Amino acid sequence: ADLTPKYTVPGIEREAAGRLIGVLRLRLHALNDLHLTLKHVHWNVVGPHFIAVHEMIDPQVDQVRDMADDVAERIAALGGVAQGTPGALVAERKWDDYSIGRADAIAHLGALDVVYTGVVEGMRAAVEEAGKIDPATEDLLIGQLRDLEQFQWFVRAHLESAGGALAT
Amino acid sequence: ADLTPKYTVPGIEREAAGRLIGVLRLRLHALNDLHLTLKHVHWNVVGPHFIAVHEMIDPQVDQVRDMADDVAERIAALGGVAQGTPGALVAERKWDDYSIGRADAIAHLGALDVVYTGVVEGMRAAVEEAGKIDPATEDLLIGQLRDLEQFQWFVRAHLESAGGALAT
Amino acid sequence: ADLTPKYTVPGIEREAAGRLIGVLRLRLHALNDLHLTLKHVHWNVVGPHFIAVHEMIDPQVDQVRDMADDVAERIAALGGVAQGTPGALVAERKWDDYSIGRADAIAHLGALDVVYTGVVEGMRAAVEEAGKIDPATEDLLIGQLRDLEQFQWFVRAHLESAGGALAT
Amino acid sequence: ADLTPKYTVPGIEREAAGRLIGVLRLRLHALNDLHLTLKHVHWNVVGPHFIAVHEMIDPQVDQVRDMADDVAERIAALGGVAQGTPGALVAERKWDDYSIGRADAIAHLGALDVVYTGVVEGMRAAVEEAGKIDPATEDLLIGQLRDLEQFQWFVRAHLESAGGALAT
Amino acid sequence: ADLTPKYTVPGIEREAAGRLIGVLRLRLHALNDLHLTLKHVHWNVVGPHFIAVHEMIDPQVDQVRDMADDVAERIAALGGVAQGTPGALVAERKWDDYSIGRADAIAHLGALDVVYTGVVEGMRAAVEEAGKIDPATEDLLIGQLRDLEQFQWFVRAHLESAGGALAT
Amino acid sequence: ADLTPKYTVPGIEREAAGRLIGVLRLRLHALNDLHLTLKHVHWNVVGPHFIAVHEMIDPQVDQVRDMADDVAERIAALGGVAQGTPGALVAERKWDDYSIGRADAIAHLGALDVVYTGVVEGMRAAVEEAGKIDPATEDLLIGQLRDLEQFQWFVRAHLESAGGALAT
Amino acid sequence: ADLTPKYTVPGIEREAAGRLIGVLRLRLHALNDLHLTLKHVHWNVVGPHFIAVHEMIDPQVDQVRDMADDVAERIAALGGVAQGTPGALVAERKWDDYSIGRADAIAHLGALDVVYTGVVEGMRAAVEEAGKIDPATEDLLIGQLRDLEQFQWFVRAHLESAGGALAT
Amino acid sequence: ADLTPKYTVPGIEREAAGRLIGVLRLRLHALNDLHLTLKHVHWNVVGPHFIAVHEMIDPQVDQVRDMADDVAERIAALGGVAQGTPGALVAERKWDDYSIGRADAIAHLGALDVVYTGVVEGMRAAVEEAGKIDPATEDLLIGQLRDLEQFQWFVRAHLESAGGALAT
Amino acid sequence: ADLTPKYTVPGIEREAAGRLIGVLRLRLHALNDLHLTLKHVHWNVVGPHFIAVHEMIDPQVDQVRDMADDVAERIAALGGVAQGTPGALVAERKWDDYSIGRADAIAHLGALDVVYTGVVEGMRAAVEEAGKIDPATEDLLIGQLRDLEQFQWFVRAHLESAGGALAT
Amino acid sequence: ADLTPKYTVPGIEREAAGRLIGVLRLRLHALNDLHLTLKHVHWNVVGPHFIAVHEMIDPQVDQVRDMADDVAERIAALGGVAQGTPGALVAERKWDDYSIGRADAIAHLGALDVVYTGVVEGMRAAVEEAGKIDPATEDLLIGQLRDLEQFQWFVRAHLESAGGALAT
Amino acid sequence: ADLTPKYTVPGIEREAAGRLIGVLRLRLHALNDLHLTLKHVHWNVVGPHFIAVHEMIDPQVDQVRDMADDVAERIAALGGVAQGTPGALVAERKWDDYSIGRADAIAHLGALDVVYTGVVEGMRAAVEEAGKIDPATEDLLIGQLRDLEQFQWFVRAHLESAGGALAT
Amino acid sequence: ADLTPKYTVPGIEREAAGRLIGVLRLRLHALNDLHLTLKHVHWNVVGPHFIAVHEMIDPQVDQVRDMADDVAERIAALGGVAQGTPGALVAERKWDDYSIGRADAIAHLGALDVVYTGVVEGMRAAVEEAGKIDPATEDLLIGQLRDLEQFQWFVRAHLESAGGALAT
User: Fold this and answer.
1) What total of structural domains would you count in chain D?
2) Domain at F137, CATH number
3) Distance from CA of C65 to the nearest CA of A (A)
4) Which residues of chain C make contact with E74, given a CB cutoff of 8 A?
5) Hey, how many other C-beta atoms are within 10 angstroms of the C-beta on K19?
6) Quick one: which of B27, B59, B35 has its CA closest to B141?
7) Measured between beta carbons, which residues in chain A are less than 8 angstroms from residue F90?
8) For residues F143 and F130, is the Cβ–Cβ distance under 8 A?
9) Range of the domain at J135
């Protein structure tokens, strides 16, 4: 439970850095589960929109792996251990595996819209906790939050009507 | 008048997103009018500083078109319509056409200094409204605001005396 | 009404250059309204063909902005003022705003097919006027005309049946 | 009928190289007919999946032209003549012209799935013959075989159901 | 015989576009037979000028494949079917297969000089027909014609005496 | 247990492809657990060899993610589902989580040497099974196997004595 | 006087090609004298606009050297000798040396405006002669003519008043 | 003492901009002293970790020079003088010269850890002052602050034990 | 004589790895002697085919140095010492120095054809030994073997008659 | 005073290397003060030549930082300490701070002309001392000397009359 | 006759700089006549070595134009006028026009060998004069001299026998 | 013994060029033995500094191969034979094979420090001989000498104490 480090970034108290490390450790499991899950969707989409969807996920895979790197190294700068192994991720995460195997591209985009709502709400909660402890970490998380919301918009636009309502 | 959307980014209430969409819709007209107006200046500057000024505007044209893209796609992620047609821009804008045709480069930089003061003050007002609704949109607008102020500094430096006063 | 310049390109009479400047000034409003309108479509397309259409417009936006630059600088070389501000564009243009807001990608491609027929016919009329005044301007416009017709073909191919007929 | 060369790669008997040259001469007609046929599909696909399919074929055109180059130069290193003219291809091939003209993108992907099954089975037969004569040629053909099967998977994924069955 | 399309480029009558489609369909067979034939020469040249000739053909292969792409897509924009399969090419062409197998590089350049005279004269005839129907297609063909004549000059320069006469 | 697909690559029987899919599904969990574990080591190495080790893992992370992509897409071409989610990986894997948190770089290289021996032996077993079913899949796995053994050599070289013995 | 070649481009009569060779031989002296003269200006401009002018000439030097290459190789394809030595240029040219040594940048731009009027009028005369003999050569010269006129516009813009009149 | 400018960025009062100019003038001396000091360390590190440390500083030198450029130009946009000369830096700074000459790489990393704690605490103090005056300057400084803390983490990781404690 | 290592790649017995190390140690002397000998030819070719031959060897020098690197590092991964010094190469090699000094390009290509037959036969013998010990090493050597045979084909093509016979 | 090192470059006596180290230590302070001073000018130039001057300094900043790196590493190879901290630079230098704050671009170029005369004369004196001790160091300094004189020429050209006299 | 400048590079007396300006003015005519003459050869070589020779001259054209730029700008830094117009070149040069029009590639290489002997001897004489006046100019000319001699070696190697004698 | 050539670079007497050829022939054996020996070290370094040392040698391998190319081609321009075969190198060299097989990275850097002292002293002796015969060759060797001494400094820095003394 106690992640207070032995040293942290100058200007931050160790006990406050331990609670920021705990916030970022769960956000790192979320980002690692999200890029594993985006590659799963990339491999297992079918149907007449295959190539478009398959190609559209690949730059988001790369962007999310970059976000996970930068959260992990911020954990390490704050004096903590960035836990990246999948047994830890599955033991500590607060959401279930993505549940779609092979499916049409539009069905996967519906399920990925729900994945991204969980991730965006987790990041928004983490921004608010980080803003009370360290503005440099808060700033890193706010830029990531906006990029994740914009890729959820590309997913949602495929499900959206001319009148601006979402199917899935 | 009412731009409340049917869905918006997770974590934001729809009525608050409608008023952020309205703020960003006017900032998008300002950014589109600004890159049209920078190309107009680029084409219609003359006199002995032509090539320097002509070349100096071109990367700002590109940067401002990128800013307009990112405001437009943030409107769409918030559930709104990014209106990009010039009849709408002219109907909804709260400033007049840039009024200089062919002129010396230093005369155009004087008039563009006034254009950028309007744009910078509009963006600063929009930062303050967005900061009450969504920190991710506020962050996007603050980085744009600083870039626009820095390009206004390149315009102003041409008009500035050794004692640090501005001509135009 | 009278756009006869004080100097023009060697070998061209000033009064003939004024009427070529008038032809190119309207073609420049058309090209500026077209790249504003292509970005509007890019931002406001939805439905299951979103990413494909959204991505397909972006290189045409860039190509049309390049065409507008080269018409504007040819106006300036002919001794005229390339008017690039949106109030002038809306005051002088001979067509209405693009009328589609958010819509499915296939609906926008129908409406953009009609936009491009207006632009292609305007450019073909301008080629024929320029060919009587200056072959160098005629040549610039003919290459632009073919590129615009080829991008209208990519729009039309989405609307076309196996038997070679167009829906919209 | 007899393609025994006057010299061949060190370590290979000339009569065995002549029969490998005959195997590779037909595989070269197949690869040349396939990249001509992929460009034909690229030009003549229509309907709402146009741009995605049109763009997806282009890197496979390039990859298949590279495969044909490398089979041809291996024929020449083995002491034979790589016949690349279309009258020879049509006289010696053991399959018919691709039979689809203009058609929807999904209809062309159905017919291209059948083209690729012929090509993949021809390459697998050629791998087994080359493996008895020269492991260096067998290795070249096995890497090509896998790349062709992976591009047939991109074609098939467009035709595949969520339960993993193929339409066409 | 009748290739009148159901739609064509704005400003062109359908019956005139059908006869331009027929002109460009044969020019596309010529360009496809030429890049197949240039690769054949590339693979089957021998003797002490091998590497120079072999390397010199490769950028012309790429340039001619680009010319075929642009004629094909202009056929499709004019409302026609760009026929790219080799059985159609051999059935409809008005010239014979290139007749040289393995040969010295200078012998192949002699035979390729004759191939290019046929192609250049076919393109010049097509420029004159296109100029009566559509200046945009005429312009595309004139630039291709000059590039093909310049690569025939590189072939001819190898066969030319100090006094400016051609051997083959 | 039964992964026989409804279609597979031409030339392969479906029941044999199901058992190859099962072999590759476990090799894909191994490659995904390995690149998650390499990033974990990258973030959590300390001590005087930090930067060298930290930098040396990064191209292997990229190479292993590429290997996982190519195994996954080969599963999909063979007619199977490439399972990429971490709950499935942890449920189906036949090895335990990497057990080192923060540690000196040389301690992590000792533990990663043991990880790579498991991965290399799993890949060598999979090469031998694939070689009985499909040479194209066997070839993909043999190239991956050699690359993984070469990166294990870079890990082992740090642990090796001048006399060629390994510490850890 | 007589430059009729022994061979020329297919489709052109030799006597007509000799007179086109004579037209292009003088246009090649003009383009070679122009890029020598642009480098002379680049080296010998002074005063407070030095760096801007000095930098602005360099891409035009490169563009004009490219124009000279393409006229020379078109002379050679037409069967003639592209004479590139400076004693021939000075013996055959119909204009005098550029007469400005070291001078302020604005004085050199005045004198270069007069150089470019001679070059543009020579090219326009050559376009009209080439259009009667060969459309492929006419097309090459028209694109060069427009590029030269656009760089003369950059020179003239430095000399131009807000009312659109030229000083020098 | 009084740095109130004659003009400043729109929306900021001049007296408040003078105190922000004073904050940023000292942060600019700190960033210039830091990149001079990083190059000093790069040149004067020795011992068995030489190349790793020497190479690791070079991208941070480049990043810190970029940070100094952007603080300086923000001073100039706010209406102030960015003082970059070393006599001013040494007269106005509030810290002493870096005191290590030639030394082992690990000794220099100990001393650079102390340099970076001073710089990070100075930047955090400047973020808090800028946040009361102008959010655009505050945002620039927060991103710089995080990058400096992350490079201090790379320095500290070399000094850190497996249990997460720092030596120097 | 005994090169059995203390450790080797997982899955390979040490005594079998020692005999593979001995096979690869001689193949590494052959590849190092070959790239030294290709540079010798590059420097010492003369006569009218100089530039073509001189340029054609340079990418093969680079490719052969890459082959030597990859054999050496495979020796090291198998637990052996990759001996790269020239006294060892000359003591252990089973062929004589290349014997041509300055000579015409065609004479050097004759002698290099004989060098490559020795190298290709040595590599084919090594493929067959490696295939009994380790498929990963066998695969590396088979790809190298084919590349070396293809560059011997470029050498032989210069010596080959139209009827497909070799001079030297 | 005594900088004789414990080792130096082979072939140089230690006492002679100590006096070369002293020469290069002062040339390194001069080059570091010059690139700090060029950035100061870049930030603090104003008036109608701003952008041209501002842009023209930036590649010289980069070139001078490269010169300082190469002098510093030559000091270290000669066995000395390259002192890079600003307190040492200000204590040991033999010239005063650059004295211009904000000023017009032409005023700064006058003062920078005087800075460069000091630097060029210091480098010429150092070339003559190095030529008596070590030709490799002399060669490095002569190339730097010429580059510095050429950038002083770009500064002086802005101040020079048509008759070749300098203002400032 | 008298080229003493009004200012020159620091450390050089004006009268000595005038005589160095005269040396470099003639070396600049030689380098400009040489790159005009290399392009002439490039355009007018024929026969079976055409492409090799034609391609081999092009990088030397670029290198010689760079040498002329750097001599010209060194003249300007020394206070002189770099005369670049062809009437001056022909009036002041001390050699005749290159005398070969269209000719076989080997005949042109013979004549270019004689051109380069004149240029190399002129540069060697200029190195010796510059070494008495200014080591920075001497150094620039020595590097150019070696590059010109190495390109003369590529020309001579085409004319050289196996016994090391030159034909032409 | 006698290497007087039949022709040499203009301005050099043949007998003096023969003795420069002999000097450069031995410097070429030294540079070829050095890049073979650097690759040997790269492959056979072990222990905890492996990756840093292994990576640090690779750009020096490339730089030394470039130095050998440029000495060889200067031998050929001087009229001599650049002998590149390893039997000649071992017969003519005046030093022994590098004697370290597998060893820790720091042991190899000790032995490579001694190799580089031999090479640097050989190059310094060759500079002094070349300076009496030809300044262009002397200049090439002086730049190589400095680069080799700087890479010996990177080797020595790993062996150096804080007080500036070398271990090995």
Assistant:
1) 1
2) 1.20.1260.10
3) 25
4) 146, 150
5) 15
6) B27
7) 86-87, 90
8) no
9) 1-168
